[PDB]
Design a protein around this ligand. Sequence first.
Ligand SMILES: Nc1ncnc2c1ncn2[C@@H]1O[C@H](COP(=O)(O)OP(=O)(O)NP(=O)(O)O)[C@@H](O)[C@H]1O
Ligand SMILES: Nc1ncnc2c1ncn2[C@@H]1O[C@H](COP(=O)(O)OP(=O)(O)NP(=O)(O)O)[C@@H](O)[C@H]1O
Ligand SMILES: [Mg+2]
Ligand SMILES: [Mg+2]
Lengths: 250, 250, 224, 224
Amino acid sequence: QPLLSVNNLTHLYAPGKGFSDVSFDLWPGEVLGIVGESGSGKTTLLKSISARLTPQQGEIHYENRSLYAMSEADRRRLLRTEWGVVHQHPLDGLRRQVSAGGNIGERLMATGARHYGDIRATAQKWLEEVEIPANRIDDLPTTFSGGMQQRLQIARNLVTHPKLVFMDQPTGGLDVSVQARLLDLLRGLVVELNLAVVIVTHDLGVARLLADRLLVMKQGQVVESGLTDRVLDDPHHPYTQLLVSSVLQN
Amino acid sequence: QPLLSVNNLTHLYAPGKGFSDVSFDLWPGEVLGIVGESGSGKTTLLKSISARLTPQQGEIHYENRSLYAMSEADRRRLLRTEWGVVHQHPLDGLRRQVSAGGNIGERLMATGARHYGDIRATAQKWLEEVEIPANRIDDLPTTFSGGMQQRLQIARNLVTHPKLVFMDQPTGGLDVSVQARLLDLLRGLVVELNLAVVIVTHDLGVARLLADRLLVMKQGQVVESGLTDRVLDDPHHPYTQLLVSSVLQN
Amino acid sequence: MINVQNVSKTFILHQQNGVRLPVLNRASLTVNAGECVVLHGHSGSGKSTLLRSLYANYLPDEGQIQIKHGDEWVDLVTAPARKVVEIRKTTVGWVSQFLRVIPRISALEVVMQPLLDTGVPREACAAKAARLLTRLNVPERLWHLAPSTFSGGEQQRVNIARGFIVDYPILLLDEPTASLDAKNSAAVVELIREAKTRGAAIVGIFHDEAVRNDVADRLHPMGA
Amino acid sequence: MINVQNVSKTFILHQQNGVRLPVLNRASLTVNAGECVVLHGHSGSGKSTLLRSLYANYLPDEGQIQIKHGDEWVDLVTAPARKVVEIRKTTVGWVSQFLRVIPRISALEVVMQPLLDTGVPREACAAKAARLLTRLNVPERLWHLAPSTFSGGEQQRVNIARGFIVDYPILLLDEPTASLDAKNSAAVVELIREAKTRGAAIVGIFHDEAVRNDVADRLHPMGA
Ligand SMILES: Nc1ncnc2c1ncn2[C@@H]1O[C@H](COP(=O)(O)OP(=O)(O)NP(=O)(O)O)[C@@H](O)[C@H]1O
Ligand SMILES: Nc1ncnc2c1ncn2[C@@H]1O[C@H](COP(=O)(O)OP(=O)(O)NP(=O)(O)O)[C@@H](O)[C@H]1O
Ligand SMILES: [Mg+2]
Ligand SMILES: [Mg+2]
């Protein structure tokens, strides 16, 4: 049974701004990429399904539990223990005045960790995982570069080994090498640990190598969906054909 | 004679953080892409050459005039009239409380424009150029999406038809279609108007299609430089070979 | 066991005046265990279209492509995406001219991964990947380096090894031996014959005459 | 006029134990106006390496590739990047199997651009692009649509038209006719012959025997 279920979800700031009539199912151990035009409502949908934006219509069920019918405490517990959220801008998902080690360890302590040495070791291990030097653990994120901050946010939202991760362009600001490292890390987590990922991306190569299923969003509506390679290589909706024709070939 | 000249430029926050011993020449009507690892000092170098970060060593000459030997008023005049700066995060180069029309028109008025109708028309024209709807001119950038904000910043820094534009990952947050639109716009500006661009990017496809010359930066030093296609297809320094081998093939 | 009935596909190119480009019209094809069927036809007859429809990479507009999954029968034309994903993970294997992999993963792990996804122990996966690479005469020095740093032929020997790492009951082969020299081609022929012997329903597209004659057990005319 | 003297190139693959892969050793080649020189050799002899060194896409470790630019002589092995950029813009043209273009630009403008970069009026550029496309029998309906939405053959007819839009004194041809059918091939042969007649120093790599015989005026053995 789906880990996450979305039925007739809709949130509109104004006619055409946001998303409307969005439904999809996500299971453990698979990746649902979301691709679309800048302004199609991908971020609004990601916020709505991640308990950060109350919808105007539709329902979201996580482990058979309506997401927004639950108490605010339960949603915060979800976002604190078993839900990961990676924002497009890393500083939005980071504590500016808290060191990188503290940023990673907040989640660990929220899950019950109470050994400072173990938290420090785990933070250093995850920094090395995203190839951030372990000597930058005590440096504030303001001293980090855009890619460094993005990787720190990814480690922060992945240290707890969550069951569901909503990411908004996690590859943005990353050089291709660390990008491949991140893709391998995400694939390993998804397959070995049965992690589920809802990723919004514009790099259709990353969606090809990572996403198992795809949603294509335009003017706030899902225009095409299905298997990632089928959609990319056999597009049906005009927008999808434009979109894959606009890819820069290397 | 070069539009911009950099000689032995160096700025280090700490040993290994920043850039050191950087020299290069940029002429009108060409693009100097900068590619490298997240943490190589690309942004620090871009700030230093854009009059936003005083170097510890070396000199920068713009039209034969030392950049940092000039008065602060002259540097601000450069950044206000004939220099464009596109930040990695669009909101850093945008006025949050000022509408998109106002954001675009600030530069125009700074160049002497004093007709409200003409400024409005130019702002709408540039919004349509980056494919932003003209009905969003009065909406604050906080209501814009990441790609919309990035395109608004690009239009703001290109409305004045500047002679030198420093961009930090301008394609970040852009779907491939509007990305191709932006690439065509930049190529047209560079060729027709002799515009010069220093662009920091991680998408090596955009550097291939746009950059005429390339710099490859690692641990704060330029490791390889030369013709874009020569560097990409005939890399010499180990890092460059790793970097181009990490590209996701579409 | 493959059962293609009345599968037809025409591409609608909205990017260019929405012109229709028919490539399959009421095609059908039956494949059984321990048999190899090779699609034969003039270029543009729908060979690639049909082969990738068998792999669900294209979606026929109408018709049925029913493949046995487990002890079931599944119409890939209407199955859910999860159903197709599992059918690829366990039932329908694919070999082609292209190694779409994550750039920085060594060749041995590129070959092991499809089997490790099935829960097989890592020692068995490593041993089988090493065996396949040795049969395809891939140098030992290249096992522990990313395929993207190799030549085209070595990358393709690695892609073939990755394709044959799992014993799929159904197998698809889009010109695996095309670029390979005679020795490496012969090795791929031997691998295909072994797959046939174990009871693999193989569907292939081959341009070389000798490879088709040595491998093909039946010919399907795609000209129509 | 092309003058290649003692050009040698060996690739150092740091990604794989830093192995050295020599591909050119003290090669030389002289080309004159109104002449076509075709590189002939076993695959792996350095044909592609030398051709792209002529276009500055690769950098020979040692040697000289001196090409006449304007009324000058320029060693592409040591010239500044700006020098090479201008030499490509005006002096050294390139035709290959691949249309690296911005995705959303129509075919007519893809063909016009290299000439418009030289300041030629837009009417003349449009007329010449239309002429080249008509000669290469590219349908009129496809002139105003992006190449990425076409088939491989049409994209390659557009790449050939873009290559021949400017009358380069030096021209390089990396198997332009390879995939083309006999009619389109013959059209490309006629274009190459016209380029030769006007006084274009053409350096080519061809696999087809008939195309090489019809075009080649001299053969350079790259086996050594
Ligand atoms: N706070 C807001 N108030 C009013 N309108 C908004 C607000 N946020 C977004 N809109 C609009 O809602 C639409 C969708 O927003 P969003 O989901 O952030 O787009 P997006 O698809 O993620 N674009 P991008 O980040 O470039 O991939 C856009 O037209 C936005 O301009
Ligand atoms: N304000 C700062 N204080 C101390 N150290 C800094 C500061 N800013 C950057 N550093 C370091 O300076 C180095 C280079 O910074 P920066 O130029 O922003 O990297 P970058 O190459 O642009 N990375 P990316 O944005 O991912 O492409 C990094 O190790 C940063 O962590
Ligand atoms: Mg967004
Ligand atoms: Mg940066």
